[PDB]
Paper text:
The 3.8 Å map was used to obtain the final structure of the complex described in this study, because it allowed building of the most complete model. Similar to C9orf72, the SMCR8N-C also assumes a bimodular architecture; however, the 2 modules are spatially separated by approximately 20 Å. Interestingly, residues 194 to 257 form 2 α-helices that fold into an antiparallel coiled coil. The interface between C9orf72 and SMCR8N-C is extensive with a total buried surface area of approximately 2,100 Å2 and is mediated predominantly by 2 interaction surfaces. The first interface (interface 1) is generated by the interaction of the uDenn domains of C9orf72 and SMCR8N-C. This interaction occurs via a β-sheet extension between the central antiparallel β-sheets of C9orf72 and SMCR8N-C. The second interface (interface 2) is primarily created by wedging of the last α-helix (helix α11, residues 392 to 418) of the cDenn domain of C9orf72 between the last α-helix of the cDenn domain (helix α11, residues 840 to 863) and the bridging helix that connects uDenn and cDenn domains of SMCR8N-C (helix α4, residues 350 to 363).
The C9orf72 protein interacts with SMCR8 and WDR41 to form a trimeric complex and regulates multiple cellular pathways including autophagy. Specifically, the C9orf72-SMCR8 heterodimer is an effector of Rab1a GTPase and interacts with the ULK1 complex to regulate autophagy initiation. Sequence analysis of C9orf72 and SMCR8 identified the presence of differently expressed in normal and neoplastic cells (Denn) module in these proteins. In this study, we report the structure of the C9orf72-SMCR8 complex using single-particle cryo-electron microscopy (cryo-EM).
Residue numbers in the entry:
A (entry chain A): 13 to 33, 36 to 159, 167 to 336, 366 to 468
B (entry chain B): 96 to 120, 130 to 250, 314 to 374, 701 to 774, 778 to 787, 794 to 916, 929 to 936
Write the structure that this text describes.
């Protein structure tokens, strides 16, 4: 009725639950945190798992798809995020549900991640919903009488990283609040064809796609002095969902967050993993510090979705071709502001402030033209010139801050033409 | 279907004392802040009855969870302080009511009867005064730290909400805060999230007729000839007045173009919007005057002025060849909502601020500078504009002007022709 998995780190989260559905059981099997000093008693956990049970029972007409739950219990301080399954008959509520258990006062930590966590787990049920017909093996009716042994394996391994993933961000202590520009920009000026020409190539690429990718290098410090820099260009809620990569911490590519890291590229050729990169919320870069190059995947929503459609059911592409004058502007003089002082940060925000505001107009602009059948926007030729958007480097950028606000915006414009 | 679900499945089965939980949907996409309102004159001496609000998309709550569950914290707690306050006081009131029993109990028992009763009812008549006096102390401590009447018990519980209006105020204010969609809302956090670090750009420039205060300007520029240098004259300044025959219009069409004015700083606005005609005075940079006495200060202040005549069009300072104002305003524009035209205007000004921001700083352009002292540095400052992507020597004035606005405040805390055409 347990399985102990040690966690590499200091302060991991709490256990997870896998209660079954004949009579609704309090809990079937509970994963375990690291060999901590003190935990929360399983008897308490068993009730907490059983608590969602009758709460889960309250649902009617079970579902068509897997749906969410989320509990915060001030009494017996805990944060719970459970799921409801789709039954085997799809109408008979053969739900079993699962939820990692979270200590009090760590919903600030959790909630930005909440998209990550649901994503990670909802894949497990997608694997889980078959429904484990390998457990429908060639076996005698005594065996066909099964749950508590053959279900846990594919459940075990595929849920092991989740605690490590959640405990990863404590280890890779991605800057929560602020940074004094231990980033690049604090230097006077890099001043050279390659690196300075590189530095613009990445940041532009860092923007025309919403979410950056690995700083896949071999310094572990000069590797980490780019990931903290290219993240000045993202929201305070995105000070998280990023990782400051650590020297040989055996940490893979995890699809959810959209700034990442590794080191040494596995000492050889290593897969992206090509499967896991699609399961990221955005296309992303392929920044280096070894080669000082950049890459990128296709446009964020007119072709990843189509690529998503190809591969979602199965179960370094291009360089920066565009040079926004606006960012070529920005980066050119940012170093000219006599760095060392507080000046660049202010300038950065004022640069940033423009983009959101200039994004917000485009939000309002297109949503102003009443959407209708046979009535797409079709006025992009007017839109480009009208809003001071003629540099193709500049257009998609603000078109790329759209999806971060209107996720369906980018299809609303390019789906019909492309 | 149409809304009924304020408590349909918006009530978890108690599940904790103050708890705050969640529900999925099918169309619900709900959220619940379960708050019980324990009632003595009620079964179990408890009353779970939890008011919150329910919206759609499952998302405009989930990532917006804190303040909503930080104000539902304040709101729902506020009412709990009230019905208890009514309830705590009235409990001793009906204690005194049953205290009167003892006043009769003593008289009835053993007066002449010599206790002809048992009377073990007197055990009831005295035990009640204990636990009710006990839960009292429970109430006051709980106050500071940590059959028709049974449903009608909810009445005064819901009725005393109406009295203790703060609970009606917050949920009214909550219905004000969140809106139909998070995104336009979401930016407002982000917009002000950025604004905390940078405030210098705030005073140097503009930052509720704002639907009309925008829409009129769009109807202005898009179909008013010669209006182009008007913006320029207004942006550069350093003064402007506009007179008209019927004042029913200037009010309408000087709130339209009030957007463009650079406010001096931590003030309200410099648009006096009109006055009489003494015209003594760097204190007011937009005036109406709604009007040969004026024709003298018209020419006596041949510098720093401009005019209008709705009767027959005119102005005073139409010289501009650069491209900036064309970006700030192009008569062949398709911006429709006008309110959006405010945004397009509002955004651009930050860039004008941004360029202006650069010029003040860079610590290589002020009097300490590399070449020499006399005027070479003034030539040197010109090469800064090569980095600063000027439009034309007319735009040189604008960015040079904003220095003065920025130069002054850091300091405090420390010649033109004139045309006209029909």
């Amino acid at each position: 009725a347990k399985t102990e998995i040690a966690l590499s780190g200091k302060s991991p989260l709490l256990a997870a639950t896998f209660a079954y559905w004949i009579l609704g059981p309090r809990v079937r099997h509970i994963w375990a945190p690291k060999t901590e000093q003190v935990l929360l008693s399983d008897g308490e956990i068993t009730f907490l798992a059983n608590h969602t049970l009758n709460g889960e029972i309250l649902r009617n007409a079970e579902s068509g798809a897997i749906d969410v739950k989320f509990f915060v219990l001030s009494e017996k301080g805990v944060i719970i995020v459970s799921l409801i399954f789709d039954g085997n008959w799809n109408g008979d509520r053969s739900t079993y549900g699962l939820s990692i258990i979270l200590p009090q006062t760590e919903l600030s930590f959790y909630l930005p991640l909440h998209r990550v966590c649901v994503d990670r787990l909802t894949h497990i049920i997608r694997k889980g919903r078959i429904w484990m017909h390998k457990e429908r093996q060639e076996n005698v009716q005594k065996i066909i009488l099964d749950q508590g042994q053959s279900i846990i394996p594919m459940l075990t391994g595929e849920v092991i990283p989740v605690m490590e993933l959640l405990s990863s961000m404590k280890s890779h202590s991605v800057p929560e609040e602020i940074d004094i520009a231990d980033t690049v920009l604090n230097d006077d000026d890099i001043g050279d064809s390659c690196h300075e020409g590189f530095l613009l190539n990445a940041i532009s690429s860092h923007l025309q796609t919403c979410g950056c990718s690995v700083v896949v290098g071999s310094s572990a410090e000069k590797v980490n002095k780019i990931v903290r820099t290219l993240c000045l260009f993202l929201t305070p809620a995105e000070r998280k969902c990023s990782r400051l990569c650590e020297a040989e911490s055996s940490f893979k590519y995890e699809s959810g967050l959209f700034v990442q890291g590794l080191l040494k590229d596995s000492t050889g050729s290593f897969v992206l993993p090509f499967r896991q990169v699609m399961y990221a919320p955005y296309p992303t870069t392929h920044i280096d510090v070894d080669v000082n190059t950049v890459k990128q995947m296709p446009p964020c929503h007119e072709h990843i979705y189509n690529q998503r459609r190809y591969m979602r059911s199965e179960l370094i592409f291009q360089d920066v071709l565009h040079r926004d004058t606006l960012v070529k502007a920005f980066l050119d003089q940012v170093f000219q502001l006599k760095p060392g002082l507080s000046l660049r940060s202010t300038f950065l925000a004022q640069f940033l402030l423009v983009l959101h505001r200039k994004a917000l107009t485009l939000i309002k602009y297109i949503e102003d033209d009443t959407q209708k059948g046979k009535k797409p926007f079709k006025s992009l030729r007017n839109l480009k010139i009208d809003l001071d958007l003629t540099a193709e480097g500049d257009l998609n950028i603000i078109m790329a801050l759209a999806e971060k606000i209107k996720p369906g915006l980018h299809s609303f414009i390019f789906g019909r033409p492309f | 279907s149409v809304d009924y679900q304020a408590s349909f499945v918006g009530h978890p089965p108690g599940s904790a004392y103050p708890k705050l939980n969640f529900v999925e949907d099918e169309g619900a996409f709900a959220y619940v802040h379960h708050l019980t309102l324990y009632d003595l004159e009620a079964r179990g001496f408890v009353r779970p009855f939890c008011m919150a609000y329910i919206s759609a998309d499952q998302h405009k709550i989930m990532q917006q969870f804190q303040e909503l569950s930080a104000e539902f914290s304040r709101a729902s707690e506020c009412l709990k302080t009230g019905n208890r306050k009514a309830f705590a006081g009235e409990l001793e009131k009906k204690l005194k009511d049953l205290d009167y029993t003892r006043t009769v109990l003593h008289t009835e028992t053993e007066i002449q009867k010599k206790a002809n009763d048992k009377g073990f009812y007197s055990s009831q008549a005295i035990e009640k005064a204990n636990e009710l006096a006990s839960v009292e102390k429970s109430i006051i401590e709980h106050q500071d730290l940590l059959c028709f009447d049974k449903k009608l018990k909810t009445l005064e519980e819901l009725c005393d909400t109406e009295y203790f209006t703060q609970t009606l105020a917050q949920l009214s204010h909550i219905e004000h805060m969140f809106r139909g969609d998070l995104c336009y809302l979401l930016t407002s956090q982000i917009d002000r999230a950025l604004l905390k670090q940078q405030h210098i750009t705030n005073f140097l420039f503009e930052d509720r007729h704002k639907k009309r205060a925008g829409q009129n300007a769009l109807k202005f520029i898009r179909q008013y000839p010669f209006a182009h240098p008007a913006i320029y004259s207004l942006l550069s300044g350093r003064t402007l007045v506009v007179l008209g025959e019927d004042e029913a219009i200037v009010r309408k069409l000087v709130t339209a173009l009030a957007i463009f004015v650079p406010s001096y700083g931590c003030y309200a606005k410099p648009v006096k919007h009109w006055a009489s005609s003494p015209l003594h005075i760097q204190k007011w940079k937009l005036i109406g005057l709604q009007r040969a006495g004026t024709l003298h200060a018209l020419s006596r202040y041949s510098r720093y002025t401009s005019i209008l005549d709705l009767d027959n069009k005119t102005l005073r300072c139409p010289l501009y060849r650069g491209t900036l104002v064309p970006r700030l305003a192009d008569h062949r524009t398709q911006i429709k909502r006008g309110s959006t035209y405010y945004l397009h205007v509002q955004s651009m000004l930050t860039q004008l601020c941004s360029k202006a921001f650069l010029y003040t700083f860079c610590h290589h352009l002020h009097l300490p500078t590399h070449d020499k002292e006399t005027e070479e540095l003034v030539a040197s400052r010109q090469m800064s504009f090569l980095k600063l992507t000027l439009g034309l020597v007319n735009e040189d004035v604008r960015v040079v002007q904003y220095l003065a606005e920025l130069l002054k405040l850091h300091y405090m805390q420390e010649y033109v022709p004139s045309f006209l055409y029909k």
